[PDB]
Design a protein around this ligand. Structure first.
Ligand SMILES: *[C@@H]1O[C@H](CO)[C@@H](O[C@@H]2O[C@H](CO)[C@@H](O[C@@H]3O[C@H](CO)[C@@H](O)[C@H](O)[C@@H]3O)[C@H](O)[C@H]2NC(C)=O)[C@H](O)[C@H]1NC(C)=O
Ligand SMILES: *[C@@H]1O[C@H](CO)[C@@H](O[C@@H]2O[C@H](CO)[C@@H](O[C@@H]3O[C@H](CO)[C@@H](O)[C@H](O)[C@@H]3O)[C@H](O)[C@H]2NC(C)=O)[C@H](O)[C@H]1NC(C)=O
Ligand SMILES: *[C@@H]1O[C@H](CO)[C@@H](O[C@@H]2O[C@H](CO)[C@@H](O[C@@H]3O[C@H](CO)[C@@H](O)[C@H](O)[C@@H]3O)[C@H](O)[C@H]2NC(C)=O)[C@H](O)[C@H]1NC(C)=O
Ligand SMILES: *[C@@H]1O[C@H](CO)[C@@H](O[C@@H]2O[C@H](CO)[C@@H](O)[C@H](O)[C@H]2NC(C)=O)[C@H](O)[C@H]1NC(C)=O
Ligand SMILES: *[C@@H]1O[C@H](CO)[C@@H](O[C@@H]2O[C@H](CO)[C@@H](O)[C@H](O)[C@H]2NC(C)=O)[C@H](O)[C@H]1NC(C)=O
Ligand SMILES: *[C@@H]1O[C@H](CO)[C@@H](O[C@@H]2O[C@H](CO)[C@@H](O)[C@H](O)[C@H]2NC(C)=O)[C@H](O)[C@H]1NC(C)=O
Ligand code: NAG
Ligand code: NAG
Ligand code: NAG
Ligand code: NAG
Ligand code: NAG
Lengths: 150, 440, 440, 150, 440, 150
């Protein structure tokens, strides 16, 4: 868990070689402590201080842990931990050397590079994913027998 | 090169600093009626998996830390939740016909008071023995000090006051950093950090002017402040040597149970066995002298090596800003710790007083009443540092003066949550590569 | 044609009418101890994104609306939650030896009462000055009116009573429709609707018989009823012109603080500076005459253009069904608004009384006590309409009579939640098309 | 958001050309207001009126926002905002002209057409999706080398 | 064979025994102010879909069952939540000047007490008529029994005490098993089980020594124990025949309302119409004799067919371990059921006493006060079994002695949750098959 | 629901022929009772006993009902109720006759067989699913035109 966060993306190219360095299961295996004793306390006590503070924190992790699954679903990438797009590396003017990136730059530094236009990338993804591609799939509803590829 | 293509990466190990709620975690051992245990909130406390990172110099802060407020507001909420179902003592604020005690030495003292009470069948009242201290009664012959402010509900005797250590565990999607740099002073980039899921055992003690049982530093006894420049900032100091405080209370302190109305017992101090001596704490003068020498030698690191004087906490004011105050086994001590501060530049007893009626230990308003403890009280453990104030003023070059200030409670837990920080986890990252989708 | 194939569509813009909880939203501005703010429940209130639809004639209803009950039950719950931690006044229900006041004009009045009180050390009682109104004391020489019903806990003086506007925001999966048709009367298909995430600023005022600060309509002053046919239905009317009510209370009203037992202060009216006049509200007779003419001219739209008469309140009942009642700066007024209703068919002062002990403003049972306000009270803002009743009876053709009825509080918020509706969102839709899966 | 709900399905064929007129992200971006201040209030107040009323409304949107994701998973359509089936337009006797449907009919009116048999369609989908198709995929576990397509 | 390949299967019908919370479910019928209904917690209670499995012999247990504690702790929590907002009777614990009653037969009795009370304007007290029973007053002329223990807050008269049946429904991801084997005794592998989503209607009655309205077994009247070997284990027995208990209370019992302070009415027993007879319950001796014969004939299954004697409930203890105690229409009966146990080896009335002040029906401490019921009380329904104890001792071979023990309340609901069990659902299963993925 | 749990896996090979004998929808359709009346009660009552006990039980089913969806996502099996792997039936020494398994053995008995090494299987799945396979997919980012299959 977080075992090579301090590494560069080249030395975090091994993190994507492993289960994103166990980040996603680490999002959900941290719930197992509060999964293990929310009920096993047998006390009356007439009142609960953590009756909301745990429960507010518990559903906070779920909604945050579902916005990404909703976002990977909207980019056709649900289930795939790593997937490429049809949108290229666009005119986003953080254009540079590849072996500057995947050799010597940390992910945190990589975040510091493209902290701007991140929402611009995020709107850009669903454009090619649905607004051209899904209607291109509806264009694959012909099934001719004599004049397919005219 | 060719046009690259953006590629999402789910589970990137990045973080942002954020703020969220945490939760306690402790262990089981019956009698979980401890006022901070809340009957074992999360009684698991599993094995402490700790992971180093070694390649990141993450910044820290202790004066902008958020966890100390979450620690502070949970303590007062665990306080009043414990104090809610106990007995109110609003029939106690009456006139008191008092007199002194005569069995032993002077300079201790106590008052022999009696009042119309026991209120049992709403119709029969009784003249009741009682034995109160000073510093909780005032003349007009007497009344309690808190009857011009609000109510005086007492503590339930079955609960305890031993600050068993707790663990703050992060919720999901968050992580607890921990600086391992043994010379990280207060604030800045820590070179060697590590990640834990839960903190270590943190005893939630409460003490003015001398923080006890601590988390002792390494042999460089550290100096902690927001900035040395402003004189109106408290200065924390952390030890490396467990100096002992053999505290005790001499007398035997018989309890006396009183019936009040319906089934609401009330405990008052009965007539004691009869050896009225003073409450005191013995401190070894040699070891205390050596610790101050280590303190002043690193105090000279911050400014010119000249003319260090230490003082008592001025004159006037209340107790809780002047005396080192604490509790020992559910018995609340107030020791005139004047006799620790002479000019150091090149066994000790301490007079301890006892209040029984306590204010809200931070606020004004509601106030609790401690029940008496039977037997002889004696307890002892370590100190870990002090809270000092630089006076400044017109001392442009020399005669540097320090007095053991500190009235807030947040600076206690600031001395232990300094090496921790909470971060959210942002598992969504993008990067351009040479892969492109095979469009069908 | 060929056999089509069903195709799911996720995110279809359809809706059903449903019922769910909403939540308040407001803004920050300290002193967030407002009884409806609940210390800024959702203090965000972001920018109001509003989206028109323009191609849908969605039906509405105001007499089957669910949001008014959620508004009504939250107000009483925000009421008692504010009133809980304040001081009980159950030692106040005692015998009162009263007499009149003599400094100024008659026809105002007040009573000079005194009682054995201050109860400080459970043992000493005092004869205490007090100055009460009428309409809150009864003979047997006197007692308070509420001592045959339940307790009389007072208001905390630090809280306020200014109805700061709130916003009901829909939760996820729901949407708030909003009819933009400027002549939508009460119920039916609205042609021009739009969608918001949160409502506009809604001041939760409370007033019988004359709703204040409102949401003013367009120049056709609208008439709202469930059905005109039944005489036992209140009639709402909405204005378009902000008519002013310059209300004031003349006197200077000195406070007097009383110690009761433990630290529970009590505030009673001290002896005032000595100019005892009447509380009154000045209304311009010209503008009031013009507004009624616009009202009656659209009242003749609903039925024959003949013989409109207006009346004072009838069938007696308690103040709150007869007088226009409200509060002004935490001071509760009761004005005999008889002098507004003569027969209109072809500056005004108003005598305002003051209660201090108030009932539960809807219910019977628990009752609050307003503390006095120092200084001179004066406040002024707009009206937005009335609540009227058609009497009917044997008037088969002529002499149509109206009296300003209205005792419920839900009809206040019915006059502002009429142009809103909540719908659930059903994002799952199916349709047949010409696509079929390529079975492997 | 809901920008062409009043349109016909022909003029809501542009809604499926866009992100279902931003309906799905609109289901989840409405949570961001209560995501932004559930904790930022620093008040003691000893008691919470919205401590349940928000929390009941919060998990109501999650379970409703998960029954559809569970239902798209059971029809093999998880991730796909638009997908066709193997079940045809069956004997459901709402049989009519296609360019009556995808030219001039609103989605609400379309719901008024097939309000009945909607659960009959919903049971019909999982029949062809699992009860024939998944065992047909288990019939693709042969891997012969000389007599594949006999 | 070839190397197989693991294949996941999502939704495998396996289960593990687990523990989680359940929730009540009932139906609607106004006056939902029932102390267990909590105003219709889940008022749906839909159609009971029940599914058999027929091919599984699943083990059960009734002495390690978890649902009985969840039933027990919800009943006490529904108790105090109902008892919270009612009137405290702490001004009632005063001295009582009592005398007897003289109108009718002896051996019933009651006490004519009077006291200084009504406390209305904090200043005027009155000598008040009252009529108390025995078994709730003690001498010193008198006081209530509970004034040496805690407070005596009374019941709200508008609520009821009829135990309407509830349904425990499992949450999601859990299932409720149900053994259908009609001779499953207490613990072991049940051959014929079935699954339900909710339990059947379970009336939460409370009765010592004789459990009423039940869930009657089949014609083999079953014997239930943890083990027969240990004599210190209660023995449950279940019936198959609804034997009747015609209980009644003779008198007419006029109420008398008392004003106490503010709007807190108090209800005391007025002077009755004047036919003071005894409370009693008629039991048919014939049917009672036949049921014991079926009991003893299956008691001889467990051990040698010789010398069965039954005895009076064990002497000593507090009524509640000796008398068959219950309530009938909010009126709490205590019947000396000695006259049911002679030696069976080869119409009956019962003297019923009435307490009015009741202890906490399990605990020590807080105590409720039942208001009186007007009119004549009579109620009747079935029994379903008893709670017996084997004495053992030196009776090595013969003279087997039984006495109707039972003081706990959990054994009531153990007699109805025996045929139910909760299991978690683990839908993730793996298996090797001949399929392999087509790697691209 | 649970209609052939007592059956052997051979007679629960019909359970996988149907919707896992309606187990997954049964996980979520049990929520519909508490979906139907959490709010329809119109009572003041000043206090809630089930205000936490329902809510703790409600979010317990969600997190348990999401750990599996997270686990099927990590094995590339999200959406697929039944899927095979690339990990074979390994050296796990519970090696036996196939028609002993898929003819005469209950699922509960099958659980009693492989109760051990179940976590060993679970770690084994993500190894072949990501740590070889996803980087093999990154090895499919070449797109040559003259020397593809050298
Ligand atoms: C200082 O450190 C000690 C270390 O445990 C803290 O605990 C106190 O330890 C003493 C033992 O020296 C306890 O005194 C006695 O313990 C025995 C155990 O057999 C018990 O039977 C006696 O009744 C007596 O309590 C003492 O209870 C315990 N707690 C307290 C509150 O003194 C101590 O808390 C630390 N002091 C401070 C101010 O942090
Ligand atoms: C009628 O509309 C007014 C418009 O704001 C509502 O607010 C009241 O406004 C008056 C100003 O004319 C306030 O009076 C004074 O405000 C000054 C501000 O400097 C303050 O320093 C004084 O102490 C004094 O309060 C008044 O406070 C304010 N609120 C009230 C309750 O009168 C008013 O609420 C509306 N009235 C009704 C019945 O809706
Ligand atoms: C024994 O079983 C009965 C079966 O219902 C339980 O309910 C009691 O039934 C009797 C009817 O024989 C009720 O008595 C009368 O009911 C009428 C209905 O018209 C009502 O108007 C009268 O005021 C009177 O209540 C009785 O109320 C009802 N409840 C009670 C508490 O007796 C009964 O609860 C069962 N008893 C036990 C100890 O379980
Ligand atoms: C404590 O260590 C920190 C580590 O960063 C020092 O902090 C900064 O140090 C630089 C370089 O000396 C100064 O320019 C900054 O002004 C320092 N900032 C602060 C907030 O101190 C710091 O000097 C060390 N010492 C103390 C007494 O804080
Ligand atoms: C208010 O506008 C609504 C818009 O629908 C009118 O409502 C219906 O109008 C039709 C046609 O006039 C009548 O047949 C119905 O009886 C009306 N229903 C109701 C509930 O009113 C309505 O006429 C307008 N006027 C009023 C006074 O409501
Ligand atoms: C009740 O039925 C159960 C069904 O298992 C019996 O339980 C076990 O039976 C075997 C075989 O007779 C004994 O070896 C065990 O000691 C029994 N266990 C227990 C806990 O009883 C049981 O014998 C039957 N009878 C009783 C009185 O429990
Ligand atoms: C005090 O210091 C000693 C010496 O290291 C240590 O063993 C002990 O645990 C400390 N704490 C106490 C006595 O509470
Ligand atoms: C009253 O009407 C005036 C005129 O439009 C407006 O400016 C003001 O905001 C209204 N409300 C008040 C004074 O509360
Ligand atoms: C409404 O329908 C008209 C057709 O008359 C069309 O021109 C317009 O774009 C539609 N508007 C919306 C918002 O669908
Ligand atoms: C008692 O037994 C009879 C006979 O079966 C039954 O009809 C009745 O419902 C039972 N319960 C009562 C009277 O509460
Ligand atoms: C139980 O097993 C028998 C085989 O003896 C079979 O005929 C029957 O269908 C099975 N029932 C179930 C519910 O699996």
């Amino acid at each position: 868990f977080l075992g090579a966060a301090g590494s560069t993306m080249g030395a975090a190219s091994m993190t994507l070689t492993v289960q994103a360095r166990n980040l996603l299961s680490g999002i959900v295996q941290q719930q197992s402590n509060l999964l293990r004793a929310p009920e096993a306390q047998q006390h009356l006590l007439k009142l609960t201080v953590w009756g909301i503070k745990q429960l507010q924190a518990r559903v906070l992790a779920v909604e945050r842990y579902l916005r990404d699954q909703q976002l990977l679903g909207i980019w056709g990438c649900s289930g795939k931990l790593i997937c490429c797009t049809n949108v290229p590396w666009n005119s986003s003017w953080s254009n540079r050397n590849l072996s500057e990136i995947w050799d010597n730059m940390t992910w945190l530094q990589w975040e510091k590079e493209i902290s701007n236009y991140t929402q611009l990338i995020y709107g850009l993804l669903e454009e090619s994913q649905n607004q051209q591609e899904k209607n291109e799939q509806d264009l694959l509803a012909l099934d001719k027998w004599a004049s397919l590829w005219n | 090169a060719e046009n690259l293509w953006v590629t999402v990466y789910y589970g990137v190990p990045v973080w942002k600093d954020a703020e969220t709620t945490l939760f306690c975690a402790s262990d089981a051992r019956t009698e979980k009626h401890n006022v901070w245990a809340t009957h074992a909130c999360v009684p698991t406390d599993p094995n402490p998996q700790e992971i180093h990172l070694e390649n990141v110099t993450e910044e820290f802060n202790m004066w902008k830390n958020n966890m100390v407020e979450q620690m502070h507001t949970d303590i007062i909420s665990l306080w009043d939740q414990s104090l809610k179902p106990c007995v109110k003592l609003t029939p106690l604020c009456v006139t008191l016909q008092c007199t002194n005690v005569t069995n032993n030495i002077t300079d201790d003292e106590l008052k022999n008071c009696s009042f119309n009470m026991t209120t049992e069948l709403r119709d029969k009242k009784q003249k009741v023995y009682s034995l109160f201290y000073r510093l909780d009664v005032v003349q007009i012959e007497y009344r309690l000090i808190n009857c011009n402010t609000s109510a005086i509900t007492q503590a339930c005797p079955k609960v305890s006051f031993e600050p068993i250590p707790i663990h703050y565990c992060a919720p999901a999607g968050f992580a607890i950093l921990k600086c391992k740099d043994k010379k990280f002073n207060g604030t800045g980039p820590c070179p060697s950090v590590s990640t834990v899921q839960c903190t270590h055992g943190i005893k939630p003690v409460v003490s003015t002017q001398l923080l006890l049982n601590g988390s002792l530093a390494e042999e460089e006894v550290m100096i902690r402040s927001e900035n040395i420049t402003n004189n109106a900032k408290n200065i924390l100091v952390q030890f490396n040597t467990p100096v002992q405080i053999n505290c005790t209370r001499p007398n035997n302190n018989t309890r006396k149970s009183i019936r009040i109305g319906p089934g609401q017992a009330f405990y008052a101090t009965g007539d004691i066995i009869g050896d009225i001596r003073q409450a005191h704490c013995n401190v070894s003068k040699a070891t205390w002298n050596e610790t101050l020498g280590k303190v002043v030698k690193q105090l000279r690191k911050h400014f010119g090596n000249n003319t260090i004087i230490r003082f008592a906490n001025s004159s006037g004011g209340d107790l809780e800003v002047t005396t080192h105050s604490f509790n020992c086994g559910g018995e609340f001590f107030y020791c005139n710790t004047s006799g620790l501060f002479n000019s150091t530049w090149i066994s000790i007893t301490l007079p301890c007083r006892i209040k029984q009626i306590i204010n809200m230990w931070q606020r004004i308003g509601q106030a609790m009443y401690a029940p008496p403890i039977q037997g002889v009280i004696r307890c002892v453990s370590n100190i870990t540092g002090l809270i000092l104030t630089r006076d400044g003023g017109s001392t442009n070059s020399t005669t540097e003066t320090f007095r053991p200030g500190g009235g807030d409670m947040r600076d206690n837990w600031r001395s232990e949550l300094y090496k921790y920080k909470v971060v959210k986890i942002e598992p969504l990252g993008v990067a351009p590569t040479r892969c492109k989708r095979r469009v069908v």
